[PDB]
Chain length 313, copies 2
């Protein structure tokens, strides 16, 4: 009932730390590093890492440099993904390669990666036992391999019908691994036992799937297939399924007429609502996994992240 | 001669020799060499893009290979490595990649103009010297090296990277600056300094021209002697370590002990 552990101000404390490390006016490699970091934004990843560490009894001083590490790793990956990405959102800020040139944007992503690795190395001096610091690097690295594999698969799997599970596995690596990178490393430094880490893993995967579905739904309120498209295909009769596959199969058709053809078929078979119910089931599975963790304001914070509109990546 | 030149001067032999020279165990250096392999290859895949096979893989694969290095390095604890040494390897490895990134930035921003002799040396000390320190620092750290030894591998790593990148400039004989051109700038009066800078600043192929003007003003010769000074500093740094066959193996690598193929392997 009553909180027996505290609830700190995670969001602003992170921003102060990253700004302290790369303040306004930095030059050299830190200038391109800072460009990827600013505007700071919500930083739900670093927020999730510290909350996961505190949910298992960890230290703020230990989890804080790991939260900085993750931001640098994710921004470095995002800086490199922008180079290979083609369609840009109007809201999305100008890509670093468009601003600094493509060669500089690659070096910048590398500086972001190694600044992350350097920040995670500071956890030893922060108080974490060297056995835990090394396990944090292992959890972080494997998550970094799933997000990179998904980015390549996003490029390859597009414009073709895939199995519903094949989409689910990819979005678990694109979105669930972003959270598992936060929850796994945060829980590890926090001293979570083996059962707690698996729960945070289940929470990360289930919430990552749900977030992606919610993103797939925004066009249904890049011309790539999404879960509402797959669910509509599964429900559509054979004649319509034939159409859905050839629409995806050939990368030589105008974008507008492609989109409207997909949007009409999704609406005809309630693909949007079906995607909502799938997302809803995985949200409840994420909250179920949380119950393994001990009750705390931090565990309440992770469950609040499952509320629609609260999580933003 | 001596130990015959083999080509492809890479960390796997620097890392293991560095680990054993300070008393390390072979059971850790082998999976560590695999970890270093990943990070060095990923650095190569990115180096191939900046000096203009597929763009997504060359980047993302280069990115993922960094993760393999750090994951495998931590994995070495199950091989029997002390967790405290592994943690320090993370710090050593991370700061080396920061030097490689900082150097590659200078390469793009220094092109087409004369830099100071000191600035070029610092750049390649972080570009290619850190690449060797990646092997020495990790191997020595996992090997149980003292702080004085780790520093001893540090000047050895840099001074070695300095020399061979100069040797690369010597093999040649964007308008990127090289040491022979730079030392030619020091001796020439303004009349020839003015010439040198315009060539760096028209088609690149014909500007065979650059080769003509470096030969007319003794570009190539000047850089050789600077290389040999760093050769000795690398050998001096090794004397801090205790004598062993591992120490001898590192000491020959200062004289050319691998082919031009090493510079082709730094490339390829
Ligand atoms: Mg190069």
């Amino acid at each position: 009932d009553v909180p027996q552990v505290a609830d700190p101000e995670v969001a602003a404390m992170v921003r102060a730390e990253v700004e302290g490390r790369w303040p306004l006016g930095v030059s050299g490699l830190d200038e391109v590093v800072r460009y990827g970091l600013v505007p700071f934004g919500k930083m739900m990843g670093p927020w999730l890492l510290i909350r996961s560490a505190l949910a298992v009894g960890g230290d703020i001083a230990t989890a804080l440099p790991a939260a900085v590490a993750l931001e640098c790793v994710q921004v470095g990956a995002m800086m490199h993904d922008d180079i290979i990405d083609c369609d840009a959102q109007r809201r999305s800020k100008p890509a670093a390669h468009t601003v600094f040139g493509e060669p500089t944007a690659i070096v910048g992503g590398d500086g972001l990666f190694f600044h992350g690795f350097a920040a995670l190395s500071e956890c030893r001096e922060a108080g974490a036992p060297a056995e835990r610091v090394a396990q944090a690097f292992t959890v972080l690295s494997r998550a970094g391999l799933r997000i990179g594999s998904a980015a390549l698969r996003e490029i390859r799997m597009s414009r073709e019908i895939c199995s519903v599970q094949d989409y689910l596995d990819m979005i678990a690596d694109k979105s669930g691994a972003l959270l598992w990178m936060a929850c796994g490393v945060g829980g590890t430094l926090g001293g979570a036992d083996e059962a707690a880490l698996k729960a945070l893993s289940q929470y990360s995967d289930q919430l990552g799937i749900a977030y992606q579905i919610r993103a797939d739904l925004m066009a249904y309120d890049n011309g790539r297939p999404t879960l509402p498209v797959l669910l509509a295909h599964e429900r559509a009769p054979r004649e319509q399924q034939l159409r859905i596959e050839r629409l995806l199969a050939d990368t030589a058709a105008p974008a507008a007429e492609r989109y409207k053809a997909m949007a009409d078929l999704v609406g005809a078979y309630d693909g949007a609502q079906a995607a909502r119910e799938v997302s809803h089931r995985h949200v409840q599975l994420a909250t179920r996994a949380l119950q393994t963790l001990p009750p705390s304001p931090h565990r309440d914070a992770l469950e609040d992240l499952t509320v629609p509109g609260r999580l933003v990546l």
